[PDB]
């Protein structure tokens, strides 16, 4: 997941096309690190490009895979209503690249709770993922309801 | 002296997605005696030498 506050007053970038290497071809970049089943980290870059009023194209790219094709088509488009609430495009399946001969990760990316503010600066408030590479028992505890938990 | 011939097992070895190569355990059924140090009677009456 990635929760972003986007600025309704932002410009549509004049520099085309979108390119991960041209910093004035997009409005905002964020990152979320995901894992494959081998446990390799993939640093997934997420780019937001305002296309017109209330719509933002979203590109993704596995920055950790040198063989990955540069993103020329959007993974999704976020559409916000008049109140700046996310109305569509908020959920999209992403497939990573591959690292050191290991199979890619495939995950649902959610933009839930993202909003378009009347005025502000583009800003990522939160990211989250259910991926990780173990891992060793550090402590354990008995809670006051008797639940036993490992940390 | 004559060589030992043994089955070597890598049971429970794993390839982690990420970590450092690390041996967690080794074990063998070989040893050179050896002298009685203590003996005991357990609470089920089993008698064991140490």
CA distance B19 to chain A (A): 9
If residue A88 lies in a helix (H) or strand (E), which one and from where to where?
A: strand A86-88
- Contact (CB, 8 A) for A37 and A13: no
Rounded to an integer, what is the distance from CA A99 to the centroid of its chain? 19
Nearest chain B residue to A131, by CA:
B17
Give CA–CA dist A133/A140, Å, rounded: 19
Residue holding tokens 């979108």?
Answer: A18
Q: DSSP letters of A107-118?
A: EEEE-TT-EEES
Contact residues on chain B for A133, CB-CB shorter than 8 A: 16-19
The gap between the terminal CA atoms of chain A, to the nearest Å, is: 24
CB-neighbour burial class of residue A62 (10 A; exposed 0-12, middle 13-18, buried 19+): buried
Kindly state the tokens that stand for B31: 């040893």
CA distance A134 to chain B (A): 8
CA dihedral A4, A86, A79, A58 (to 10 degrees): 30
Contact residues on chain A for B19, CB-CB shorter than 8 A: 133
Resolution in A: 7.1
CA distance A34 to chain B (A): 13
Residue holding tokens 């059924």?
Answer: B29
- Contact (CB, 8 A) for B33 and B26: no
Chain B positions touching chain A (beta carbons under 8 Å): 16-19
Give CA–CA dist A10/A28, Å, rounded: 10
Contact residues on chain A for B16, CB-CB shorter than 8 A: 39, 133-134
> C-alpha angle A82/A83/A88, rounded to 5°?
70
Identify the experimental approach: cryo-EM
Contact residues on chain B for A36, CB-CB shorter than 8 A: 17
Give CA–CA dist A43/B49, Å, rounded: 59
């Amino acid at each position: 997941s990635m929760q972003i506050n986007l600025n309704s007053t932002d410009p549509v970038p004049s520099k085309t096309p979108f390119s991960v290497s041209d910093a004035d071809s997009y409005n905002k970049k964020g990152t979320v690190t995901v894992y494959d089943s081998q446990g390799n980290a993939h640093d997934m870059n997420v780019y937001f490009v305002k296309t017109k009023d209330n719509e933002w194209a979203v590109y993704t790219h596995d920055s950790s895979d040198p063989a990955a094709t540069a993103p020329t088509t959007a993974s999704t488009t976020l559409k916000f209503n008049e109140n700046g609430i996310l109305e569509s495009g908020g959920t999209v399946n992403i497939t990573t690249g591959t690292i050191n001969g290991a199979t890619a990760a495939t995950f649902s990316l959610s933009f839930l709770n993202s909003m378009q503010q009347n005025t502000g600066a583009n800003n990522i408030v939160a990211t989250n993922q259910n991926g990780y590479k173990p891992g060793d028992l550090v402590s354990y505890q008995i809670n006051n309801d008797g639940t036993v938990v490992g940390n």
